[PDB]
């Protein structure tokens, strides 16, 4: 069961509302593994709050360090079910253009560029 299946729409919108009362500039990001990925490990946690000014290469480098991936392993992020943005892009601009109708920014990761 994915995050969207676990929590209802009403509950997810409330989550986002609550968390941005506390942290008005931080980005609520849902990070999950792509259903078909076997090589990369599932992340310990799903819900992340990330600062506005962090860019995508910084975000991927964080997650790589959390997962202790060795240097030769590939790591790709697919956003909102379709978007592979430039890694130079701050996560705040991604949230502006790619956030879900519930207020979360959904991503999935994999080690293959196809999805």
């Amino acid at each position: 069961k994915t995050f969207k299946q676990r929590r209802s729409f009403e509950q997810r919108v409330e989550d986002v509302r609550l968390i941005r009362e506390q942290h008005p500039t931080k980005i609520p990001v849902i990070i999950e593994r792509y259903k078909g990925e076997k090589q990369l490990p599932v992340l310990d946690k799903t819900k992340f709050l990330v600062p506005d000014h962090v860019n995508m290469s910084e975000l991927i480098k964080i997650i790589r360090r959390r997962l202790q991936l060795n240097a030769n392993q590939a790591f790709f992020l697919l956003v909102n079910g379709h978007s592979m943005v430039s890694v130079s892009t701050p996560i705040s601009e991604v949230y502006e253009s790619e956030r879900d109708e519930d207020g979360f920014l959904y991503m999935v990761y994999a080690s293959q560029e196809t999805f």
Partner: peptide
């Protein structure tokens, strides 16, 4: 068993 995971500055710095 709390869902919200914030990245510390320590963690963010170490990325760069």
């Amino acid at each position: 068993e709390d869902d919200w995971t914030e990245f510390s500055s320590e963690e963010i710095r170490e990325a760069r």
